[PDB]
DNA sequence: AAGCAGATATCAC
DNA sequence: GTGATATCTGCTTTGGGTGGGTGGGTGGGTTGAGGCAATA
């Protein structure tokens with residue numbers, strides 16, 4: 064009963080395996096001057112100081128991050144009756160786009176169950192509400208691009 | 209002995225327990241009466257009852273089972289012989305309803321105490337004989353003697369009594385008296401396992417009537433005595449290791465998972481006008497809108513008539529796009545059938561289809577007189593394809609390996625699931641070229657069904673509502689569905705038991721005319737049918753007759769068989785270019801239009 | 816170190 | 829004085845590579861690299 068986090072280089076893995084993943088993220092690095100300049104500035108600072116450049120909000124240490132993660136995991140939020148129609152409306156919208164794209168996307172009935180799974184995870188961070196479904200939807204469509 | 213056990217007091221207390229205890233006529237008095245009626249000399253006693261009546265007797269039973277249980281046997285025997293003036297005397301088997309310990313928490317303080325543990329059986333040994341009484345014969349005068357075993361040690365005689373010769377008594381092994389013993393390996397239950405640790409295992413020893421009472425795969429609560437035994441350093445020396453090994457002496461097993469009224473209910477169902485559709489609906493309530501596939505699977509479950517001159521078995525292949533409900537259907541059929549096997553065509557698979565010193569027959573042989581569900585049909589290698597063709601054509605599996613030459617009966621119905629070679633079904637491609645399997649193998653299936661994924665929005669919305677409703681289904685509905693499934697299983701069992709349909713004259717004429725018409729369709733313009741299909745119809749017709757619980761095949765059965773066959777062909781025999789009537793794709797693997805185009809290409813290149 | 820095979824002196828009747 | 833029967837003495841054991849690969853792997857020892865036939 065474990066979660067699977069896989070990393071692969073595009074060539075050809077079987078489709079029967081790729082459709083099982085809730086999120087399939089294609090990380091593509093297209094060269095662009097300003098972004099490449101910003102990335103280089105970040106990396107040089109890390110080599111220069113052995114830590115990330117300062118930001119407005121300070122990152123939390125691992126010791127402290129593992130406490131919140133465990134604390135959140137105790138909750139068991141549930142999805143109400145009311146959201147049933149709204150989640151359904153999102154599913155058909157995703158399906159329509161997949162058929163229109165004509166790409167090798169894996170939007171199927173399995174996708175509907177994935178919306179619920181992510182939505183409850185988002186709530187466990189925060190009873191599920193419409194804002195968790197919106198974040199779950201946004202995260203997934205951004206994945207299929 | 210360091211025990212506060214007075215035998216007489218314990219026996220009296222237990223006799224009092226049998227006399228007076230009442231389950232909230234004494235319960236165990238009724239049990240003794242039932243023992244007399246049945247004749248099985250075993251009385252099971254719930255330790256919770258003994259605790260409730262008497263807390264001292266319970267405490268002594270748990271602490272000193274070896275000493276106390278025989279006194280219980282004496283008490284029960286005395287009482288029973290009073291109330292009813294049997295191969296053996298009755299034996300008490302105290303047990304705990306629920307486990308009192310976890311396999312991981314067994315401790316030295318529990319040695320020689322009565323405990324209950326839960327687990328799953330993985331291995332059982334063959335029977336081990338234990339000597340109880342040794343038999344000696346003088347090698348000079350043939351005088352015979354018998355010696356009782358004493359704590360695993362035997363007092364060999366030194367001088368013959370009759371002739372006084374010394375060292376003349378030889379042990380005759382096969383004139384002695386032996387009792388049965390069995391070694392069982394119990395695996396820790398998945399629920400009680402801590403996260404990420406490998407399961408623990410325990411050794412159990414069963415004796416006499418408790419041997420062969422469990423089989424590998426069983427989930428059982430075992431009540432027995434915890435034992436510690438020394439380990440010899442090597443077989444030759446009498447030195448022992450300071451760390452003891454442990455096992456459990458089994459005392460009680462508890463396996464933790466027709467009637468005339470039942471037959472009357474089944475017949476009442478069989479009288480209903482729409483029994484076919486009722487059973488089809490009950491077959492797989494979770495799957496949505498696949499009515500014809502469900503009807504075909506029901507007919508496969510019932511099967512045709514075993515003529516004993518003719519395969520009576522119905523083979524069904526479900527090919528389709530990924531993300532449909534094919535695996536769920538296969539799982540539901542596997543659960544339903546009594547002698548079924550669920551397996552995969554991939555070679556790496558844990559359970560294999562092929563037979564492979566112990567002779568290991570594959571799933572196809574194991575599913576003899578049953579259904580074999582094969583999930584990744586398209587992923588079979590060439591050897592597995594040959595094996596499957598042999599099974600489907602001849603219903604036997606031949607092996608010639610490691611000096612063993614034999615033929616194994618495999619009369620099994622194949623329910624197969626197949627995916628396309630591409631990421632999606634290609635409408636331009638026919639069935640043969642969509643799934644890379646030989647046409648010779650495809651021609652052995654009675655029915656091929658296509659589970660395509662629609663582009664319709666309304667279908668998506670309806671399926672979404674179906675799945676959400678299932679996601680919120682209530683416990684009473686689940687229980688009702690389970691009851692309906694049990695009714696279906698009983699109906700199928702009864703039909704297999706007692707119904708053997710036979711072709712009536714009207715059915716024969718209907719079948720002949722049906723075949724002639726199917727041929728005529730092609731003959732009008734190619735060939736639109738071949739004789740093998742006629743056989744399929746017969747099988748299907750018989751299956752339908754069995755669903756009604758009828759011993760005669762009627763014209764209605766033939767009409768239903770024709771409709772189902774014609775629907776399956778319309779699903780899977782369609783040429784994407786022109787039409788459907790062409791069945792040459794199944795017989796030859798190449799579309800007639802494709803054949804003409806290839807002929808044109810070859811002739812042009814020959815120009 | 817531990818145990819069986821062989822040799823042999825020794826009590827008992 | 830003979831029949832046990834109790835005491836004493838010498839052998840070899842173990843698994844092991846100084847005990848061999850000219851004993852044999854049907855007497856019994858994980859891990860890796862290297863030829864085959866069938867394989868794709």
Ligand SMILES: Nc1ncnc2c1ncn2[C@@H]1O[C@H](COP(=O)(O)OP(=O)(O)OP(=O)(O)O)[C@@H](O)[C@H]1O
Pocket residue numbers: 079082172173176494495496497529530531532533534535536627675
């Ligand atoms: N017709 C349907 N009825 C019910 N559930 C369906 C249907 N079609 C798809 N589903 C849903 O899709 C999932 C079924 O996936 P399943 O493992 O059965 O697919 P499959 O057909 O074996 O395909 P594959 O192995 O290619 O993924 C479940 O969420 C099931 O609810």
Ligand SMILES: [Mg+2]
Pocket residue numbers: 534535
């Ligand atoms: Mg599947």
Ligand SMILES: [Zn+2]
Pocket residue numbers: 346347348349350351368369370371372373376
């Ligand atoms: Zn004798």
